[PDB]
Design a protein around this ligand. Structure first.
Ligand SMILES: NC(=O)c1ccc[n+]([C@@H]2O[C@H](COP(=O)([O-])OP(=O)(O)OC[C@H]3O[C@@H](n4cnc5c(N)ncnc54)[C@H](O)[C@@H]3O)[C@@H](O)[C@H]2O)c1
Ligand SMILES: NC(=O)c1ccc[n+]([C@@H]2O[C@H](COP(=O)([O-])OP(=O)(O)OC[C@H]3O[C@@H](n4cnc5c(N)ncnc54)[C@H](O)[C@@H]3O)[C@@H](O)[C@H]2O)c1
Ligand SMILES: O=C(O)[C@H]1O[C@H](OP(=O)(O)OP(=O)(O)OC[C@H]2O[C@@H](n3ccc(=O)[nH]c3=O)[C@H](O)[C@@H]2O)[C@H](O)[C@@H](O)[C@H]1O
Ligand SMILES: O=C(O)[C@H]1O[C@H](OP(=O)(O)OP(=O)(O)OC[C@H]2O[C@@H](n3ccc(=O)[nH]c3=O)[C@H](O)[C@@H]2O)[C@H](O)[C@@H](O)[C@H]1O
Lengths: 315, 321
């Protein structure tokens, strides 16, 4: 089987490409233009491993500025992860790259796939389509995004449904809930908090730090994601939440980091940032049934793997 | 009060400006960049009448290339109608202008409205956000667009909710269902079919013609739209369907046009086009409660009004043609 992974150099993409190459039957093409919030220097580390593997080909081009026909000619399966993420930096003049890379990219990819016989188009979306909800959110709730980021990502999901309904592109949508671990993007909370604690800088807390997330360890994220390809149930057309083992507030995470490091951290409490919910909490009922998905990695184990990664990254 | 109408020279926006200016208390600012499917020639006639009213100011500029600060200073209410419409022409390389003019325009207008104090931001959306649904659809149904056009308009609606929840911009969303009547855009079904019927050319029918729509006569559309400004109900944050008196198939519309025109039309049945639902049908309970909205124009009367308009347009002897 031959698999296209968009955003292959990023946090999740780089890990997905590695998981797929462990199956000797899979050949992987990754495409990534090295844009978004992660500096390109921190991303070439994500893929040095991948380039050595002979069943892996890499293309360093903009999806909007590449021959999509030739790229897709022999592809069985597309994993679409390329996007501009980041809830907090999608306002004012920063919005355009979200529309270009989350809406125009998705539309251009689906236009290239509409006359191709794919087995699956696996589109990666986000808990940020949901906005503020009481309790564990399942995939049938009316999504009302709180951020412009969330809007552009919901717009990509909608494009998948348009091309599925009209051209029978075999879409599956996965909604990730805050992914963490080694190679986590430097604009995310745990990367920032661990780097600040290691440099003896004040920890930046937005709001009161009592906000919670369904933190999903990267290896759990990748198991659900690979499962979306390998499951024997028809999941064509389904939206599936992929969430984590254990929910935690930022205050809780800072305590667990102080226990790993033995350090006492200075908290810097800043203004809340608009467009973030107080709580995310995935119902993973559907991923249970359809993918046999069960997250196994504890926050203490995950947090420590990310801590080690951050120490190695900056030494 | 002072009202800004984006897309003021378009089909609906030109009728809304005309309806608002009948109120001596309303001053209207219209902005329109003369783009989208209607050629700039036919569009100038839409507003002919309006430049005479000294309470009307017309601005011919791109919302993305205009001082929105100067534009919004004195505005009490924004009617946001500017967009690229057309379900059928929203694929492939035609998609980018829908994204620029439906998503980036809405975001940039909401950004400019952050630090003024509107009474209302009345955002015009479409039944195309719902996709294929059975029965009369209410505003709480999960919208799953069938067309790239539908996606861009649903994205505008979500941007309204983001700017509402975060910055208390007092958004109201109206979902129109297929609007027809005098000044209807030349890319729409009735304009095309009437023009083909008038010229004794084959009538272009997509699919078998049994597809139905909630056709909204423009005066009905516009009464619902002014009601969104004038209701004493609190409708801030609400999505409201605006639908028509009578649902009909394309085959039924053609029969009614044959009766108005006295002509026997040749049918050219074409392959159905992607992105179109078989049916649209608004549940207008909400608009009835919240706006006192009740559509009163029959298809027979509305179709005759559009028939006469299309005939007059293509004689090219009226000043406005
Ligand atoms: N990290 C999370 O917690 C999280 C949670 C929910 C959803 N997601 C989604 O998962 C996906 C990956 O997130 P991530 O954290 O790995 O992000 P990332 O920025 O590390 O990786 C995405 C990659 O996409 C690439 N890309 C963007 N636009 C491109 C374009 N036009 N052409 C080619 N390459 C392009 C970037 O260069 C980047 O390397 C995204 O779709 C994101 O929205 C992430
Ligand atoms: N006509 C219908 O049946 C119908 C039904 C549902 C909803 N709608 C919505 O009603 C609104 C009006 O549609 P219409 O049929 O009157 O269309 P129209 O094309 O006649 O009017 C829209 C106007 O917006 C202007 N415009 C577009 N982008 C602009 C920009 N960037 N800056 C300035 N002006 C810009 C165009 O020049 C055009 O005159 C749209 O928002 C459309 O989606 C229409
Ligand atoms: O864009 C993405 O890919 C992701 O964006 C969302 O992830 P988030 O929850 O934003 O992740 P994360 O950056 O770990 O912030 C976590 C918390 O820490 C707070 N936070 C953050 C940084 C900081 O320095 N301090 C702080 O308190 C911050 O206020 C927040 O409350 C989606 O939920 C996710 O599904 C995905 O789309
Ligand atoms: O943005 C817009 O302005 C509108 O786009 C949508 O209007 P539509 O329904 O497409 O209108 P309309 O062009 O009158 O086609 C009606 C029917 O005639 C058929 N049709 C059309 C043309 C033709 O020559 N022959 C034909 O059979 C065609 O197959 C279709 O079934 C939204 O529903 C509306 O809410 C609004 O957003």
């Amino acid at each position: 089987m031959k698999i296209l992974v968009t955003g292959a150099a990023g946090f999740i993409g780089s890990h997905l490409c590695q998981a797929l190459l462990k199956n000797s039957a899979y050949h992987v093409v990754g495409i990534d233009h090295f844009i978004g919030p992660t500096p390109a220097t921190l991303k070439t580390g994500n893929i040095q491993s991948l380039e050595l593997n002979s069943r892996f080909q890499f293309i360093r081009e903009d999806i909007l500025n590449t021959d999509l026909s030739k790229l897709l000619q022999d592809i069985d399966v597309v994993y679409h992860l390329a996007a501009i993420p980041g809830v907090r930096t999608s306002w004012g003049k920063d919005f355009q790259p979200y529309v270009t890379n989350n809406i125009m990219v998705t539309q251009q990819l689906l236009e290239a796939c509409k006359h191709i016989k794919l087995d699956k188009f696996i589109h990666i979306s986000t808990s940020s389509v949901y906005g503020e909800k009481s309790g564990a959110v399942s995939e049938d709730l009316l999504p009302i995004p709180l951020s412009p980021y969330g809007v552009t990502k919901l717009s990509g999901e909608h494009l998948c449904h348009v091309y599925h309904k009209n051209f029978h592109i075999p879409i599956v949508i996965l909604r990730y809930f805050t992914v963490y671990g080694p190679r986590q993007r430097p604009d995310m909370a745990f990367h920032r908090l661990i780097k600040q604690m290691l440099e003896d800088k004040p920890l930046t807390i937005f709001g009161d730090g009592t906000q919670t997330r369904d933190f999903t360890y990267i290896d759990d994220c990748i198991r659900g994601t690979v499962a979306a390809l390998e499951t024997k149930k028809n999941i064509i057309g389904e939206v599936i939440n992929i969430g984590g083992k254990e929910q935690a507030s930022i205050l809780d995470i800072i305590s667990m980091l102080e226990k790993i490091s033995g350090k006492s951290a200075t908290k810097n409490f800043l203004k809340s940032v608009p467009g973030e919910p107080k709580q995310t909490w995935a119902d993973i009922s559907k991923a249970s049934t359809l993918l046999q998905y069960s997250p196994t990695v504890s926050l203490s184990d995950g947090l420590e793997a990310e801590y080690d990664y951050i120490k190695q990254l900056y030494k």
